[PDB]
Design a protein around this ligand. Structure first.
Ligand code: V91
Ligand code: V91
Ligand code: V91
Ligand code: V91
Lengths: 131, 126, 126, 125
């Protein structure tokens, strides 16, 4: 048996509209995502990835079966999103991730003039494959 | 069986007004890049960007990264992207992209100074 | 006992003119962040930022990320950073940072608009 | 077997003009980092960064974290990264990195302040 490491990145990006939107009061557009770090086809071993949004969103249990594993929405506030990665192999248990959706730019990055809020974290999906 | 994810599309920026010399209103850059950072020149020989016949030398080509073509113009048209590979037995990949210049009704004043129209795809090998 | 690498420091920006009300000339933000991004709040209870005694409320506390404190002033002084951990059986980690406001004769003479001064360190706890 | 994932590469930033003293245009930082927020100095003795032979002391050696080398210049060139281990019976790992300085037209129009070229690898024990 060999140890197999699949490095991934996950989190969300966000952009401020500049003001409140008149129709719904939304202020940001954001995209929560899960990506492989390397330029590889993650669908070779991932069956699906579900993003559990806040209950106020329509169909809050989002399911992405085809890459890219990204969900783009709008809103005005920050809430926790549960990410669960399901694998094709039935012996490989799913990975559950927790991400606080970040909309508001930190003071440090605002002074640095960064144009996009980026809240990205890392994970090492570890597998044990027979040789 | 090796799958290489890519994204393709264009970015564009409005001049603010029409340019008097040629009537152009936007500068745009059509591009192809990997979904995640990698040396795509290890397996891509060159990428052709077939512009509208109005442009001089409409069949542009880029032989090394970054695979991008920057131009100006006044309207939206279809660009044909043809990706050639170092492996002489790998058939080229042809993509079609509609150049986006004008912001939609959504991102009209939503702080987007540069419009983006980008799409995910996958190149499959052997 | 685990070692968690961190980066601490500050960014600063000149107003462009001395503020007449209080003579302040710069806005700055002192911060602590992990070397590689991670949820520091999983093991950090709070971080205290002790400013110069002349400030109003010189002792600031941050309990949730981003662990940053923004203020204004006219000079460079030493800030004491105390990092408290969740496990109550843990002495805090004390960092010392000299706030940097003024652009050097070469480190930012290329026309830069923001000053940055940060350093690497490690937290040995638990 | 123990697997230690790492990332390596460089970040670059344009000066805004060309420095008249030496013709340099960019500042860059070549580095090696752990993938997660760990302490590599528990098993890493030193990391060598072999710059182009024109630089002064081109064989830069970093014996304590962070494993970064910041310099300036005007062109892109290959850097050889060699990672030495505390265990004397572990063979060093050699990495090759092409320094990236120049920003693409796409990222320039997007207003990105920084050029990044970073890659993933693993050290197996
Ligand atoms: O903000 C917070 N929770 C949020 C949950 C949903 C938010 C949002 O922005 N939404 C756009 C939207 C609509 N879809 C259709 C009509 S409305 C739902 S915010 C908290 C509480 C303490 C601090 N953070
Ligand atoms: O816009 C559209 N077709 C366009 C084709 C070329 C366009 C452009 O921007 N051009 C600058 C220019 C030159 N470059 C060098 C000499 S001329 C040509 S536009 C359509 C049809 C109706 C709405 N969409
Ligand atoms: O400058 C220096 N120490 C500084 C201490 C406090 C500074 C500051 O900027 N502020 C306090 C504050 C106030 N606003 C109203 C009343 S107090 C804004 S500076 C040194 C000593 C030698 C050279 N560097
Ligand atoms: O550019 C290239 N190779 C380079 C090697 C070192 C470079 C550099 O920028 N610097 C050395 C240094 C000095 N300043 C004064 C004395 S030494 C600053 S460039 C080529 C040709 C096309 C791509 N590869």
């Amino acid at each position: 048996g060999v140890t197999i490491v699949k490095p991934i990145v996950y989190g969300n990006v966000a952009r401020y509209f500049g003001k409140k939107r008149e129709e719904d009061g939304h202020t940001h557009q954001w995209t929560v995502y899960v990506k492989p770090y390397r330029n590889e086809d993650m669908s070779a071993y991932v069956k699906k990835i579900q993003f559990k949004l806040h209950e106020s969103y329509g169909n809050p249990l989002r399911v992405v079966t085809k890459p890219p594993y990204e969900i783009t929405e709008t809103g005005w506030g920050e809430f926790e999103i549960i990410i669960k990665i399901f694998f094709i192999d039935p012996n490989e248990r799913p990975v559950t991730l927790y991400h606080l959706l970040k909309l508001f730019q930190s003071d440090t990055n605002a002074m640095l003039g960064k144009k996009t809020v980026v809240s990205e974290f890392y994970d090492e999906m570890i597998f044990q494959d027979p040789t």
